[PDB]
Amino acid sequence: SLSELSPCHVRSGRIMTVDGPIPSSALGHTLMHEHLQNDCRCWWNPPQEPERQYLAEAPISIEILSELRQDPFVNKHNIALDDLDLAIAEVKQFAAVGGRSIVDPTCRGIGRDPVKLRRISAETGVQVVMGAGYYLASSMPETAARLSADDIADEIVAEALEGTDGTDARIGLIGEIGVSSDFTAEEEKSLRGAARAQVRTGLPLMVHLPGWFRLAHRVLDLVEEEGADLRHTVLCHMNPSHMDPVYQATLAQRGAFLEFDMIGMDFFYADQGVQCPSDDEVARAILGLADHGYLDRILLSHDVFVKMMLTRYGGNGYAFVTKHFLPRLRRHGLDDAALETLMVTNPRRVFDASIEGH
Amino acid sequence: SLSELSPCHVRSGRIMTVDGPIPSSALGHTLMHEHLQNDCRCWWNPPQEPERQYLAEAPISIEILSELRQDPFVNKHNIALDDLDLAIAEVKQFAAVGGRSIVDPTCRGIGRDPVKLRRISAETGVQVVMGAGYYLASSMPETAARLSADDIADEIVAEALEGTDGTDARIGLIGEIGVSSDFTAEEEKSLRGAARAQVRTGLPLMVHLPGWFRLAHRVLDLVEEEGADLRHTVLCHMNPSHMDPVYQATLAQRGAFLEFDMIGMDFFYADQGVQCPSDDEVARAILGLADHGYLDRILLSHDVFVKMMLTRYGGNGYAFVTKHFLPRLRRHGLDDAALETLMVTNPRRVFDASIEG
Amino acid sequence: SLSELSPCHVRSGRIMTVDGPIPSSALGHTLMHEHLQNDCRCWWNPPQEPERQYLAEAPISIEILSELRQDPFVNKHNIALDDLDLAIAEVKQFAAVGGRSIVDPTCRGIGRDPVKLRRISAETGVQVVMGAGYYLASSMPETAARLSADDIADEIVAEALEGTDGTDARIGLIGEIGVSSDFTAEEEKSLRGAARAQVRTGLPLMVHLPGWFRLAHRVLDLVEEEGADLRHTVLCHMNPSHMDPVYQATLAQRGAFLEFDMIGMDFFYADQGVQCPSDDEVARAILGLADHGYLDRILLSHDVFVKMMLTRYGGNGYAFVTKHFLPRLRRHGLDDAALETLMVTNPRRVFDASIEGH
Amino acid sequence: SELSPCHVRSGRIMTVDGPIPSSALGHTLMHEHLQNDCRCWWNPPQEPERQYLAEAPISIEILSELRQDPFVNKHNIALDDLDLAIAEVKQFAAVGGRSIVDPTCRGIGRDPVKLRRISAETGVQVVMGAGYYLASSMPETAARLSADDIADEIVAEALEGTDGTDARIGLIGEIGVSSDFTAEEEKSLRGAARAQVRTGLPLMVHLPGWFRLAHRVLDLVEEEGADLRHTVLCHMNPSHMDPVYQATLAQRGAFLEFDMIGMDFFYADQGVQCPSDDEVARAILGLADHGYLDRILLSHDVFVKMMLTRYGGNGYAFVTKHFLPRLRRHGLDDAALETLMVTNPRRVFDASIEGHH
Numbered sequence A, C: 001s002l003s004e005l006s007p008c009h010v011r012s013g014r015i016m017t018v019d020g021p022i023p024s025s026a027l028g029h030t031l032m033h034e035h036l037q038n039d040c041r042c043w044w045n046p047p048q049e050p051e052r053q054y055l056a057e058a059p060i061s062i063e064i065l066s067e068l069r070q071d072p073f074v075n076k077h078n079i080a081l082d083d084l085d086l087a088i089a090e091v092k093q094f095a096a097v098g099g100r101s102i103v104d105p106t107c108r109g110i111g112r113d114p115v116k117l118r119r120i121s122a123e124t125g126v127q128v129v130m131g132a133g134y135y136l137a138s139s140m141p142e143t144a145a146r147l148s149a150d151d152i153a154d155e156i157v158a159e160a161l162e163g164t165d166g167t168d169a170r171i172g173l174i175g176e177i178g179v180s181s182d183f184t185a186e187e188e189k190s191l192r193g194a195a196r197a198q199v200r201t202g203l204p205l206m207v208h209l210p211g212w213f214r215l216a217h218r219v220l221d222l223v224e225e226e227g228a229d230l231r232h233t234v235l236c237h238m239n240p241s242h243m244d245p246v247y248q249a250t251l252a253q254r255g256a257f258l259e260f261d262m263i264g265m266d267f268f269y270a271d272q273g274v275q276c277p278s279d280d281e282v283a284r285a286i287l288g289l290a291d292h293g294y295l296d297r298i299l300l301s302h303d304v305f306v307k308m309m310l311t312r313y314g315g316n317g318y319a320f321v322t323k324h325f326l327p328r329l330r331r332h333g334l335d336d337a338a339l340e341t342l343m344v345t346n347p348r349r350v351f352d353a354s355i356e357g358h
Numbered sequence B: 001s002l003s004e005l006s007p008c009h010v011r012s013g014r015i016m017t018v019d020g021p022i023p024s025s026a027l028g029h030t031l032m033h034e035h036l037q038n039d040c041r042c043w044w045n046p047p048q049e050p051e052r053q054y055l056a057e058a059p060i061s062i063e064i065l066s067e068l069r070q071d072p073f074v075n076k077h078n079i080a081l082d083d084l085d086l087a088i089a090e091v092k093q094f095a096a097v098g099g100r101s102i103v104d105p106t107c108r109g110i111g112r113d114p115v116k117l118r119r120i121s122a123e124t125g126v127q128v129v130m131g132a133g134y135y136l137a138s139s140m141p142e143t144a145a146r147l148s149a150d151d152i153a154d155e156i157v158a159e160a161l162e163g164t165d166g167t168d169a170r171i172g173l174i175g176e177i178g179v180s181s182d183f184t185a186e187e188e189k190s191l192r193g194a195a196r197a198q199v200r201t202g203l204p205l206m207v208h209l210p211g212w213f214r215l216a217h218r219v220l221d222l223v224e225e226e227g228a229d230l231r232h233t234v235l236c237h238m239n240p241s242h243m244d245p246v247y248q249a250t251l252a253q254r255g256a257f258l259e260f261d262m263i264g265m266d267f268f269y270a271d272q273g274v275q276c277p278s279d280d281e282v283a284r285a286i287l288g289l290a291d292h293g294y295l296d297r298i299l300l301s302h303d304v305f306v307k308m309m310l311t312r313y314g315g316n317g318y319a320f321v322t323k324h325f326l327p328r329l330r331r332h333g334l335d336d337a338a339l340e341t342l343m344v345t346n347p348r349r350v351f352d353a354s355i356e357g
Numbered sequence D: 001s002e003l004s005p006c007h008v009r010s011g012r013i014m015t016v017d018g019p020i021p022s023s024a025l026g027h028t029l030m031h032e033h034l035q036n037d038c039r040c041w042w043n044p045p046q047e048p049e050r051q052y053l054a055e056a057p058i059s060i061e062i063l064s065e066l067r068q069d070p071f072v073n074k075h076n077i078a079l080d081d082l083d084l085a086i087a088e089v090k091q092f093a094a095v096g097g098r099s100i101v102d103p104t105c106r107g108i109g110r111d112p113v114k115l116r117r118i119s120a121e122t123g124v125q126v127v128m129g130a131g132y133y134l135a136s137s138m139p140e141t142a143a144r145l146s147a148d149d150i151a152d153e154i155v156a157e158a159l160e161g162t163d164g165t166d167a168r169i170g171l172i173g174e175i176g177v178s179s180d181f182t183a184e185e186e187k188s189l190r191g192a193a194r195a196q197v198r199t200g201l202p203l204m205v206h207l208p209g210w211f212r213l214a215h216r217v218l219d220l221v222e223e224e225g226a227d228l229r230h231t232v233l234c235h236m237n238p239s240h241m242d243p244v245y246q247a248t249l250a251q252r253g254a255f256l257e258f259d260m261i262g263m264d265f266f267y268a269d270q271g272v273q274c275p276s277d278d279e280v281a282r283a284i285l286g287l288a289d290h291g292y293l294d295r296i297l298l299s300h301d302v303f304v305k306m307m308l309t310r311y312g313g314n315g316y317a318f319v320t321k322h323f324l325p326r327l328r329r330h331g332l333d334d335a336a337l338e339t340l341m342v343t344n345p346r347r348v349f350d351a352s353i354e355g356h357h
Ligand SMILES: [Mg+2]
Pocket: D152
């Protein structure tokens, strides 16, 4: 009969960062979905072609970038953000263009580390909000199998109230819960646990979608069924469904945030046989959603999750959305006020339910 | 006329390479539009902000590739393909995947050099066809002002029959004739001279178009009134108008080749404020044209023209179309017969009028 | 204090017809929006060109139908359904093809008459449901100016519980509430009173939209803030917005019924300068709405409201949707189950909240 | 030696009342039937509940049903009321109409005697067509006829007379091509095409509007050596949603005739629906936007009694009185309306008229 709400629940007016609560007004210019450190080794796509073996063991170098872009998971070096010093330098680029906060949804199974997040936040001066929960079935630890939906919910609640991974750092978002195109029983159990935790903690809920598929409405049905708040639920990886305006708009209508977290990402995922859309295509979709009154549901990010996405390795880094995509949205007809809404007001809205709509 | 026809005119069944004539059947798997060596200094886009000054004088390195992709012309090192050894290595990648010939439309003003082409063909074993004529106005030498359209046609005729740039290497195509969005009086004179040379030499004609505009029909009107053969006229840079199927299909109907020579190029040209389309968007356009029966008018290439487009500098190289785009077209529905038509039959059709449609 | 619910509220399982309550299961094959008798003289479009003067005064004859189709409101004889015997014969055609019920939304200002409706239901054997409330501004009674939103709600509640126009006939639907492209303060007051009546009586709410505009979301916003049930709110005249799938789908997602009540109407309204879409264009829009999972929100009717729409005058009559449009929907891809859903299940859903969705 | 005295390069047009300079054609309807017989398309109702729609004369109370199955009514499928035809045509002259091209040919009731009565009484100039229509309407005698025999007949009607009169044809046309494109219809079309070469008159071809046989039709016509720039493709209305199909046909040089303006019936016998005027207007705008305004023709194809104002139809003045205003609402200016109703019809019959909007 005790309340389990986070001291930084959506009706508190505060946000839980790895360094403690901050007023929602201090969030400022924000990147809603970025990985600062992680481990994607489980997604390694072994080259079966004899001609393509050199791509697996070699460290990222300028001469192999083209091939990596057509199959980023083929390279072992690429699939792990484990360079803290580089992470710090790359994040400083964001801070250099006004960046103030970063939401890191790296959860259980893919390298979440509060100790490392605090080091980055302290050295960069950029505020960091940490996520929680379980990812895709393949990344789930041996122990998850014995856990019930409520057991998973309990773990999340504890991280929002007590601490995480043996530290007193607490989460500020229940996030990047894995839902694959197969939407396995494990994943459903995981999502139900996250949704129940959303109700118990009052924290925003972020769900990883299989972007090239269309399970978003089924995802929201489940969240809604568990009693969670759709207006504080974020649907990740919307970029690939840019050509389905009805799909995207009806989702926004239900209240969920539509996160276009793949800005700048243009890879072809050989494994899945899917292509990331262009920024122009995404820009038009965003323009369409805004024209239909859903501007306050749109979120932008890069979803940096591999080394080749850092500028040091030829990538766009964490300052690309701010430096290059915003000007592109301008070219598509969006005004300054809209840009402020996208990078500042909407992120705040995800965490603060008292913020008026658009 | 007759005496001025190239030994390899479009009704000869032969093709003129920098190393001499070859039967059209020997052309094989081809890239219709690539620059092996060139000079694009005249297009350098000086960095306005003193904060981007480093992007101008610094050499290309993996750490600045993102910025360069948003403004390729800001970097001086990037705007000139001048390393022959690298050109040779990059071209071998194409040969390694079945590549047999490359058409280099580098013409006057942008660094055409028959000696270097011959070295590349010698060391790679890849057949090279050399272009000719004048490019965009800003690249034209001061001596071009004195030339009449006929004088320009005469120069082209001489390179088709006797030699080029002080060598005995003869051209096998007229082109990458520059037409800017402004279509200046000089560019018009240049194009008329090219069209007249097309009639006189009987060689294919290739025209550079400002891809983000829609001047193609005006271009064909002029080529046609000058008496040139539209069925052996190639319209370059069609990638940007992928969203205008009527425009593209009507051009194909008139008989011209639609060259999607920007496969793999995804830069944002800041100077002009235009964006290169994605390969998926281009693939859909190609499928559409084929659905309407215009498959025999489609050509593919990369238009490699700056350093960052080579694999050595993080780019796609000359083997990308073959290795990665053909599979993409396969994913879109084109069968193997169609891929053979695109990389072998069509290129042959450009140079040989006897190939059935 | 004390309940004001109609004996046939949406959770009653019954429906109020001019002849009393009937189980919702008895509604059957239904036309959700038809006028059996009405008066549209206040919408006459006088021909400025003296050459077209003859069309204004002349009676409807086969010789001038072409001209009338290009400007229906030019003819005085056309803008009033006043022949009860013809109405009865025309309605018998609907019954002749399986029709069981008709919903007549003719309200105050446009000729609502419970006496006539009863004679029609009596002689045709077709069940008739009567609407209520006020229509567009220009048709509103002088007295409506003094009425407050609550007074309007009170009038509607009285017709749902006691009787209407001096009779004991009670209403079964609240509506064909007028909302013009101008959405005047009076129309807003009218709609607010209607929505309050929806909450108090529990009866369905039907709203007239200026189809060629996009005010539907603003309409639902108002019905929503007044506490009314969007799930039993019908948005009329959706046909003209067939080319705006995002707009239509997002309205359906909010829960409102999308009424394509202009089936068969292909006139050009000279006055407004608007053109009625073709049945093929509408069929495609309907297919799309269904493809997106909104089939249970789709309603179909003719909105017969002028003499020229009756078969006697060369028009389609009341049996057109059933005899000709359903087959067209089949040619487009809909099966008999879907057709059954459109003409029976959905109409029942309008009046009965116990009907399962999907 | 077989050119009509009013061939397309003569500057003249052959009407049923003799030659007239092309400049005299004026405001014209390119495809209308003044008198005809469509009894062969009788679509009798096999259900008792629709038996009344068969032998009953058209009346106001059955119009809805007829619009859903035009051929179900006997009275409706024959324009045999000359007095009514005159009255209806006068409506067209009343709004500026000067000429009407009647493509009614062999098999569907062509009658020079009746056309002359109509022209004399209304003051409207009439151009008469020729050739054979759809397979199901060809006479038994056409079976033995070879393509050349068919062309011979057309030539005689162009130079000597028609059906025993001295009235001569001014257009070869409304040649029948069904969705099946039968052997007999192909022979008919080849004969028409050869006659186009011999007489130099324009060629008009009936197309199964809901299909896509136009390019195949133009292929045949072209190989028979006929003039594509004076070939008219009828019934383009139904392919309005295929801008590439329509634009490419226009690029080949043929006229695109939207002769079903105002026609909104559902042909139960074919299971096809006539498009709305708004949809057609959009298609016309698109073609003009891509520079094909000079290839666009408009008409009603009045061919059954219910299409006459007396029977609730639109009559022969609808295009002029109601569709032009619709085109204006869509964005076309007055000069474009002049181009559509006067200049283009003249272009059909006169090759000396230069192109453009
Ligand atoms: Mg002979």
